[PDB]
Amino acid sequence: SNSQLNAMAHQIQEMFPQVPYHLVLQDLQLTRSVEITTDNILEGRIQVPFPT
């Protein structure tokens, strides 16, 4: 439905005001848990916005 996935990503976006929302919504479909997404963001799961 993407009703909960989007909602969860919205919260994460407030925790990390430097990550692309379109990417957060992507990981939410692979992890399906804020406890993993947000943590893995620091680990290097999601590609950070690099000047390219």
Binding site: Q11, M15, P17, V34, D39
Partner: protein, 76 residues
Amino acid sequence: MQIFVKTLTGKTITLEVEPSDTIENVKAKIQDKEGIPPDQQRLIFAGKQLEDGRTLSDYNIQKESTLHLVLRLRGG
């Protein structure tokens, strides 16, 4: 001074801390409040993590500053 610790659940925890307070001590307070082990407590500020061996003054944390508490796990 008062700080606002936000969780991934949408909870806003108000904690009493001072410039001389330690990041590790702050996490300990949260452990007593919510019951989250320090291992699962990742304090992020403006997108960067705070080192335990630092104070609030080291990051120029002023009054009413919002702290981002990133939840985590290593189970699977």
